[PDB]
Design a protein around this ligand. Structure first.
Ligand SMILES: C[C@H](OCc1ccc(CN)cc1)c1cccc2c(-c3ccc(CS(C)(=O)=O)c(Cl)c3)c(C(=O)O)[nH]c12
Ligand SMILES: [Zn+2]
Ligand SMILES: [Zn+2]
Length: 232
């Protein structure tokens, strides 16, 4: 009923959208992994009379439900998708997207890692993102590679029309008391990568984490704090 939807409010298999700004939504889904249930976020950005999708809804059936929810709530076709790193909450569902006519994209680093892990593999490679600090335009967004953080390949996404920063899994929500799933992370480099985000996007008004509630720029400093303390 208008609040940001939380893990126990979304049954696994259902998707909800949340309006972030004019022409910007997040998508929220839930998934079971190793016997626990987690929420995760992605982004939808209006691209004229088409939509750009950022990240799957964490699984094939969730991603089919995402496409149905978009049709119900927005009614414009999803034509392109970008996955912001190689984990299943970002690429799981790419095969569903690819069969629904969506062109799927990721960095070459993400594509390699997805392939090596046995995860679904986006079709198209995004060049120009291999060195930290790199940025490229992709429709109505800018894609930015901040350096290694949650994963070596993680990308963040900025919507300049709305000053929306989608941090993906390199950014944690304010209530986080832990650095999440760090199996593929670089805890030593993560603060430096967050500092790069802070320097590059000082006018961000909304910051969206990969999991949990959006907020403001404080999510960036909070993330650095939880990562340093996790390492400590
Ligand atoms: C799909 C992804 O696969 C990762 C993976 C890696 C390696 C292997 C081995 N090949 C297998 C799987 C995955 C699965 C399950 C949970 C997560 C979480 C997660 C997010 C927030 C919290 C709350 S908190 C207060 O700590 O911030 C917590 Cl506990 C966890 C994240 C995330 O941090 O991005 N990613 C997750
Ligand atoms: Zn991840
Ligand atoms: Zn994640």
């Amino acid at each position: 009923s208008g609040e940001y939807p939380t893990v126990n409010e979304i049954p696994v298999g259902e998707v909800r959208l949340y309006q972030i700004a004019d022409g910007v939504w997040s998508h929220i889904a839930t998934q079971s992994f190793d016997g626990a249930v987690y929420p995760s976020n992605g982004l939808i950005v209006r691209d004229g009379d088409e939509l750009l999708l950022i990240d799957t809804a964490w699984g094939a059936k969730n991603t089919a439900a995402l496409l149905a929810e978009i049709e119900k709530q927005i009614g414009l076709p999803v034509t392109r998708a970008v996955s912001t790193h190689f984990h299943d909450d970002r690429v799981g569902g790419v095969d569903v997207l690819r069969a629904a006519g969506v062109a799927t994209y990721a960095s070459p680093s993400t594509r390699r890692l997805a392939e090596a892990e046995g995860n679904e593999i986006p079709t198209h490679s995004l060049e120009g993102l291999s060195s930290s600090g790199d940025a490229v335009r992709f429709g109505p967004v800018e894609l930015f590679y901040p350096g290694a953080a949650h994963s070596t390949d993680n990308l963040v996404v900025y919507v300049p029309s709305a000053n929306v920063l989608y941090g993906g899994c390199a950014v944690h929500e304010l209530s986080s008391t832990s650095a999440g799933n760090v199996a593929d992370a670089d805890l030593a480099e993560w603060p430096t990568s967050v500092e790069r985000i802070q320097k590059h996007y000082p006018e961000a008004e909304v910051v969206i984490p990969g999991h949990g509630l959006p907020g403001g720029l404080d999510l960036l400093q909070h993330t650095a704090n939880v990562v340093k303390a996790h390492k400590n």
